[PDB]
């Protein structure tokens, strides 16, 4: 009742992403990403809901009724919304790897920590039997992983040693013998210790300096230089769409959602920094 059904999904970044927060963090960045309490990037539920709402209002410019029912209304005449988003928690950021003693060549891997999988488990178990879906095949894998907490774990491969992001030497260990990978990709996944993970990850985040040029002399304008922070292409965020049951959800979550693969998240889309892909956890 009142969230009788739930659908989780992965937000797989197709291009770099910027979801701003002003100048919200004490950092060397002028336009940082949206941070968690642990400083990991996240996508607030407001941004996620607003972006998907705006997208659906133009990709199905006739279902205004259904989208306005589920994702709420804009004008003052309103009524209780009946589908909500949870903040997108970062799942796995990409990482350049130089593997020592491995003949399976890998130029990049996915990197997680245990802090992150803790929250992913918090989301997944809070739905598993609370709602009427079957995601044991994933919550149990994450539980297996969190069992080995404290040490750098490599999944679905055997590397035993690697240099991550060209600056960090880690020594891995296979989980048991192998675990059926949790992403259709073939890229390995590494669940690093929380201490070195938040360095490898802050090394994966793109932090560029941008310039504003004076046209009549092609020289930078004074005070025309700032720094941004995108999250790399191929990054993966995780969140859930929590929906009540009011005969619009039966339509929203059945034909609107079946058609969604790509949406645009966050700002700077003229720089092409918003394309992202939604894979629903149904595989």
């Amino acid at each position: 009742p009142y969230y009788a059904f739930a659908e989780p999904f992965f937000i797989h970044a197709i291009t770099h992403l910027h979801v701003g927060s002003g100048s919200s963090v004490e950092e060397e960045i002028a336009l940082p990403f949206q941070r968690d309490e642990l400083g990991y990037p996240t996508i607030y539920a407001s941004s996620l809901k607003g972006a998907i709402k705006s997208f659906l209002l133009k990709e199905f410019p006739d279902k205004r009724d259904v989208i306005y029912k589920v994702l709420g209304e804009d004008e003052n005449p309103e009524e209780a919304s009946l589908g909500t988003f949870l903040d997108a928690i970062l799942f796995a950021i990409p990482s350049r790897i130089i593997e020592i003693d491995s003949a399976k060549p890998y130029v990049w891997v996915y990197v997680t920590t245990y802090e992150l999988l803790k929250k992913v488990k918090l989301y997944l178990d809070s739905i598993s039997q609370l709602s009427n879906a079957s995601f044991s095949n994933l919550k149990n894998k994450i539980d297996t992983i969190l069992a080995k907490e404290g040490k750098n774990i490599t999944l679905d491969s055997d590397l035993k040693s690697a240099i991550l992001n060209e600056d960090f030497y880690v020594e891995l260990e296979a989980l048991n013998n192998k675990i059926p990978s949790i992403i259709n990709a073939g890229v390995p996944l590494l669940v690093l210790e929380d201490s070195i993970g938040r360095e490898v990850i802050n090394r994966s985040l793109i932090r560029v300096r941008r310039i504003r040029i004076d046209r009549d002399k092609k020289v930078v304008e004074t005070g025309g230089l700032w720094s941004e922070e995108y999250v790399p292409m191929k990054t993966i965020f995780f969140s859930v769409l929590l929906g009540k049951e009011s005969k619009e959800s039966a339509i929203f979550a059945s034909c609107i959602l079946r058609n969604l693969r790509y949406v645009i998240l966050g700002g700077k889309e003229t720089i092409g920094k918003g394309i992202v892909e939604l894979r629903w956890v149904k595989d």
Binding site: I100, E166, D167, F168, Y169
Partner: protein, 151 residues
């Protein structure tokens, strides 16, 4: 992580600023810093380590006032040809390698003390080239900064 490296860039140093006196092969150390660093992170640690040992012989006063910077302070590495003044960078690399446990002072010390074992030391480094190049990265860039700042 590598925050201790910025202190190691001093406790290893102990002097390469007037122990490298006479402003010739002293101001050549900036060249070492910049060029060697760039080449280690484009060519490799091995192609550069060979190139560095070629400019510094084995079993001579080079080795004497190179290991002397393991248990002493005053090591005036003077000499115009960068051969006693080229072991500066070689000692820079070796002090890091030993004080970070990448290789042990046992094997290294006992290795640069008879000709039979220099081959094995070099092969050991060849087996640890990626690890060394990744770890010593910041420790070396710190000295490339320390040169263009002070040296």
């Amino acid at each position: 992580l590598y925050e201790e490296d910025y202190k190691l860039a001093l406790e290893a140093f102990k002097k390469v600023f007037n122990a490298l006196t006479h402003y010739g092969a002293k101001q050549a150390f900036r060249s070492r810093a910049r060029d060697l660093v760039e080449e280690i992170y484009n060519s490799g640690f091995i192609p550069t380590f060979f190139y560095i040992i070629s400019k510094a012989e084995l079993n001579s006063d080079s080795l004497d006032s190179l290991i002397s910077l393991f248990s002493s302070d005053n090591a005036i590495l003077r000499g115009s040809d960068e051969n006693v003044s080229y072991s500066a960078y070689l000692f820079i690399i070796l002090y890091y390698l030993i004080k970070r446990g990448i290789i042990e002072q046992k094997f290294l010390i006992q290795a640069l003390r008879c000709e039979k074992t220099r081959l094995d030391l070099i092969d050991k480094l060849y087996n640890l080239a990626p690890i060394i190049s990744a770890k010593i990265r910041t420790y070396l860039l710190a000295i490339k900064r320390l040169s263009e700042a002070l040296i």
